Design a protein around this ligand. Structure first.
Ligand SMILES: [Zn+2]
Ligand SMILES: [Zn+2]
Lengths: 167, 167
């Protein structure tokens, strides 16, 4: 599949608090969380982002705390993927489990406002307004399957469903 | 935003039964419904469709019965939009209410398997593999707002949320 949208570029070490400040963690509504996505470093993000857009960052994106809210804040902004040079281990796992696609690439090649086209099958990112394409690395194995199902929950109910018609 | 994927082309008068045969209506799981999307005319659709793809049809798509399951079957296949020459009135309404985007265009310009790029802001559909772009008509007014919120439910809770912080 192909994910195409506007890129919102950030730097290195964008941690969970920058993604979704601790004080907002006192809410249930995921959309409530989404309304403050990236508010830690860019108070204008929630008002600029559009469904289908992509967050682009530097090294160690999602750094810090084991917050499922961080990935939920991103996912509920209508963002299907995050492109970064590297991802904090815990964030990566949480992203996979909620259906948020973590993509690895040299983000120095991407500028804020660029229109990017991520082709998950070819594992390339076309930066349409810059007439260039860069390679990327998408999730594989189990993580790819969980992502394909849209998250851990779906993956598990599809596993049960199969077992259902098994007898 | 931009929706880009592979087009699955169908003809005129594709009714709700073709979209989701009556016998399957005895289920709760939307994914269960999705597994038989378009099974009425193409038993291979469920196995060919990929998240991000687009259904393209002729006149009067969604014809017939007031089945919310038809739009749910499409939406749960990972299909965000349906491009047709015209839409049955009831289907159109149901689509809007679940966040499925009904787009009007001369689909004779689109062939099965074409890669299409729907730009909702420019109201154009780029048929990338055919080096051509055609105009389309996207939803406006209230319908556009409901769609933007992702469905009637979200639209309503966003209306309440606003009222909440009002006093
Ligand atoms: Zn850090
Ligand atoms: Zn009919």
């Amino acid at each position: 599949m192909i994910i195409k949208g506007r890129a919102h570029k950030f730097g290195d070490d964008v941690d969970t608090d920058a993604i979704i400040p601790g004080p907002y963690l006192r809410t249930t509504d995921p959309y409530e969380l989404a309304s403050h996505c990236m508010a830690g470093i860019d108070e204008n993000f929630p008002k600029k982002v559009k469904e289908g857009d992509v967050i682009v960052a530097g090294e160690n994106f999602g750094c810090g705390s084991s917050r499922e809210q961080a990935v939920i804040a991103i996912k509920y902004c209508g963002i299907k993927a995050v492109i970064a040079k590297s991802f904090a281990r815990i964030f990566y796992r949480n992203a996979i489990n909620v259906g948020l696609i973590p993509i690895i690439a040299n983000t120095d090649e991407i500028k804020d406002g660029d229109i990017v086209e991520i082709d998950l099958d070819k594992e390339e990112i076309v930066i349409t307004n810059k007439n260039k394409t860069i390679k990327c690395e998408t999730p594989k194995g189990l993580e790819r399957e969980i992502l394909a199902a849209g998250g851990l929950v779906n993956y598990l109910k599809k596993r049960k469903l199969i077992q259902s018609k098994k007898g």
